[PDB]
C-alpha cells in the first residue's frame, strides 16, 4: 500500500480509502474494479527486495498511523508508531507465509521449528486432490471418505480453496493418560468411531501396459494363454481374465492374481502379463482400452481398496504432532464426560511441555467454542484474538472456561480425580500405514551377482 | 478447481521448478586471533 | 499440489540461512528438514 502524506487534511495516510474498498466488495457481490485498477490508479506498488532497501513500511494500516492522546491485559505487546515517514504499508503481515504455513493455526504460538515440520507433513496427508478423481488413472492415490473443513481456520485458506477440498477431520480429542498405550507419542483411538466410519480412506492404484511393435511386423497380444510350448507364464491365477485379456471392474482380485494377459512371439508363448503387486489386494475399479499414436493397444487398469485405520497407522495434527495408534478402545472402555460425549482420540499429556506448541492447545479451545456457536473460528496468524477472549465465550456456553471437563473412568464409572483438556482438534491422516510396511523373510529371492538376499519388501527381499 | 501451471508430457504431469541464481557483493571479515591472516574481503562472483 | 507449484531450487556464502531480504518474498517456516535444507525454498 502506498502512504504518501499528500493529505492536505492532516498527517501522512494510505492513498486507498474505505471507498476504494466498498467499491471492490461491490464487484465481489457480483459472483469492473479489479486488481489492475488498484495498480493503474497508483494506490499499490510492486516492490522487490532491492527497492525495499530504500523505503520504510508500516505493519498495520491503523495502529501504526494515528496520534497519541487502557490497554488490554491479555493481548500481546506490540511496540509503537514512532515515525512519520512510512512510504508504504503491508496489506497484511500473514502474507510473508507460504502455502503450507497458511494452514497452520495460530502459528504465532509455536516454537519456530514446530511449524517447519508441519510444513512437511501436510504433504503426507490425505484428502481430495481434485474432484475429477473418479476419472483419473494415476498410479496410486488416496481419498478421505468423509472430509471435514476444519473448525479452526485461517483467512488465508479462502484462497487456498480449503473449505472445498480439506484434508482431515475434526476429532473429539482428549489429552490425558489412560491405559498407557498413548504413551511416548502415539494415541489411543476410539474404535467405535473408527467403525462408524471415522478416518476411513480410499486407495487407488493403477497398472499399465502397451503392445510393443517391431518394424519387421511382430506383435505382442492381449489374450488368455496357457502352456503351449514356452511355459514361461506366472504363478498367479489367470482364470479371472476375460478374453480381451482384462479383468472386468466388478471382480475381487487379491494375491498375485493376473490383471493383464499379454503375449510375445519369439523364434511361441512367452508371457508379459501384469500381476497385482504381491502384497496388495482389493477390487478392480475401472479398466480402459485405448490407442497410442503408433496404433498400439494401450491399457490402464485401476484397483480400489478401502483402508481402515488400524493399530500401526500414523496420524497427526497441524503442529508436527506426528504420532501413531497404539490401541483402539470402545465407548465402554473409553473415559466419558457426564454430558455423554466421549473421545475419538486420546493423546498423551507428555507430548506438550517440550514441543511447546501451544497453538495446538489453543485450536482445541477455539474449536470447542465454534463447535457450539457454529461460527467458523478464526485462528489466523497475528490478529487481535486471545485465550482470555475465548474462555469468556466458552463460559457463555456452560463448559469450564479453560476446556477441562470432569470425566469418569469407563471401566468402573468412577470419576477421574483430575480433569482432562477435552475438545475438538483437526487431525490429518497421513499415508504410510502399517500393513504397507510389515515385512518378513526367511530365505527367498537371491541376487545374481552377489548371491545375497535381494533388496526391498516389494521383491520379497531380506 | 485445478489451477494448472504444469505441463503434460508422455502422460505424466511435469512441473518445472524455480532455479535460484546473495552474490556479487563485497564484505570484510575479521579472522580469529590464532591465524596469520588479519582481515579479508570476499565476493561471490556468478554469471546472472 | 499448490505448494509444489510455488517451489524454488538452488544449486551447490551462508545460503541455507534465513535472510532479512527473504522477508515477504519467501516463506520463513516452509522448507525440507536436513539434507538440502534451506536450498529449496517456498515463495
Amino acid at each position: 500500500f502506498i502512504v504518501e502524506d499528500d493529505e492536505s487534511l492532516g498527517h501522512k495516510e494510505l492513498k486507498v480509502r474505505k471507498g476504494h474498498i466498498a467499491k471492490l466488495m461491490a464487484t465481489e457481490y457480483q459472483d469492473e474494479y479489479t486488481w489492475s485498477s488498484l495498480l493503474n490508479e497508483g494506490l499499490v506498488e510492486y516492490i522487490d527486495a532491492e527497492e525495499e532497501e530504500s523505503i520504510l513500511i508500516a505493519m498495520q494500516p491503523e495502529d501504526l498511523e494515528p496520534a497519541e492522546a487502557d490497554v488490554d491485559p491479555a493481548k500481546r505487546i506490540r511496540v509503537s508508531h514512532h515515525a512519520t515517514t512510512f512510504t508504504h504499508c503491508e496489506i497484511h503481515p500473514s502474507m510473508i507465509l507460504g502455502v503450507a504455513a497458511s494452514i497452520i493455526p495460530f502459528p504465532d504460538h509455536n516454537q519456530s521449528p514446530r511449524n517447519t515440520y508441519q510444513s512437511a507433513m501436510g504433504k503426507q496427508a490425505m484428502g481430495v486432490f481434485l474432484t475429477n478423481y473418479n476419472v483419473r488413472m494415476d498410479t496410486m492415490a488416496n481419498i478421505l471418505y468423509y472430509p471435514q473443513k476444519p473448525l479452526g481456520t485461517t483467512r488465508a485458506m479462502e484462497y487456498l480453496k480449503f473449505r472445498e477440498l480439506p484434508a482431515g477431520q475434526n476429532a473429539i480429542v482428549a489429552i490425558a493418560c489412560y491405559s498407557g498405550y498413548n504413551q511416548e507419542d502415539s494415541m489411543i483411538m476410539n474404535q467405535s468411531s473408527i467403525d462408524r466410519g471415522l478416518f476411513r480412506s480410499l486407495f487407488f492404484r493403477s497398472y499399465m501396459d502397451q503392445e510393443k511393435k517391431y518394424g519387421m511386423s511382430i506383435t505382442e497380444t492381449f489374450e488368455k494363454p496357457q502352456r503351449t510350448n514356452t511355459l514361461r507364464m506366472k504363478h498367479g491365477t489367470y482364470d479371472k481374465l476375460d478374453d480381451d485379456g482384462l479383468i472386468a471392474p466388478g471382480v475381487r482380485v487379491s494375491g498375485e492374481d493376473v490383471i493383464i494377459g499379454k503375449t510375445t512371439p519369439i523364434s511361441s508363448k512367452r508371457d508379459a502379463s501384469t500381476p497385482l503387486r504381491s502384497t496388495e489386494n482389493g477390487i478392480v475399479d475401472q479398466v480402459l482400452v485405448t490407442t497410442n499414436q503408433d496404433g498400439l493397444k494401450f491399457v490402464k487398469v485401476r484397483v480400489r481398496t478401502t483402508k481402515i485405520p488400524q493399530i500401526g497407522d500414523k496420524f497427526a495434527s497441524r503442529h508436527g504432532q506426528k504420532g501413531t495408534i497404539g490401541i483402539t478402545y470402545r465407548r465402554e472402555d473409553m473415559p466419558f464426560t457426564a454430558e455423554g460425549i466421549v473421545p475419538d482420540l486420546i493423546i498423551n499429556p507428555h507430548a506438550i511441555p517440550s514441543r511447546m506448541t501451544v497453538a495446538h492447545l489453543i485450536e482445541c479451545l477455539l474449536s470447542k467454542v465454534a463447535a457450539l456457536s457454529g461460527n467458523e473460528g478464526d485462528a489466523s496468524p497475528f490478529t487481535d484474538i486471545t485465550v482470555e477472549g475465548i474462555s469468556k465465550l466458552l463460559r457463555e456456553h456452560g463448559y469450564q472456561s479453560r476446556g477441562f471437563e470432569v470425566m469418569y473412568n469407563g471401566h468402573t464409572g468412577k470419576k477421574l480425580m483430575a480433569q482432562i483438556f477435552f475438545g475438538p482438534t483437526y487431525y490429518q491422516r497421513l499415508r504410510h500405514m502399517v500393513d504397507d510396511k510389515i515385512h518378513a523373510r526367511a530365505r527367498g529371492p537371491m541376487q545374481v551377482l552377489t548371491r545375497q538376499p535381494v533388496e526391498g519388501r516389494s521383491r520379497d527381499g531380506g | 478447481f485445478d489451477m494448472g501451471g504444469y505441463f503434460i508430457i508422455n502422460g505424466s504431469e511435469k512441473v518445472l521448478i524455480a532455479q535460484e541464481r546473495a552474490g556479487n557483493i563485497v564484505q570484510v571479515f575479521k579472522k580469529a586471533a590464532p591465524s596469520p591472516i588479519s582481515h579479508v574481503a570476499e565476493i561471490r562472483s556468478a554469471l546472472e | 499440489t499448490l505448494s509444489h507449484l510455488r517451489r524454488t531450487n538452488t544449486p551447490i556464502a551462508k545460503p541455507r540461512q534465513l535472510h532479512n531480504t527473504h522477508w515477504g518474498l519467501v516463506c520463513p517456516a516452509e522448507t525440507p528438514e536436513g539434507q538440502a535444507c534451506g536450498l529449496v525454498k517456498n515463495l
Binding site: 495516510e13 471492490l24 465481489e28 486488481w35 491503523e62 502474507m95 483467512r155 | 501451471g5 | -
Partner: peptide, 30 residues
C-alpha cells in the same frame, strides 16, 4: 464517506481482489 481511513478487516478485501486476478500460480503462468 468515500475517502476515510481503513481498518484491519478491510485489508482482506484487497487481498481477495489480488488472487481474483492473479491466482496462486501466476508466476508459472505469466
Amino acid at each position: 464517506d468515500e475517502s476515510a481511513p481503513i481498518t484491519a478487516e478491510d485489508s482482506w478485501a484487497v487481498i481477495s481482489a489480488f488472487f481474483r486476478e492473479k491466482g496462486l500460480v501466476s508466476q508459472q503462468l505469466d
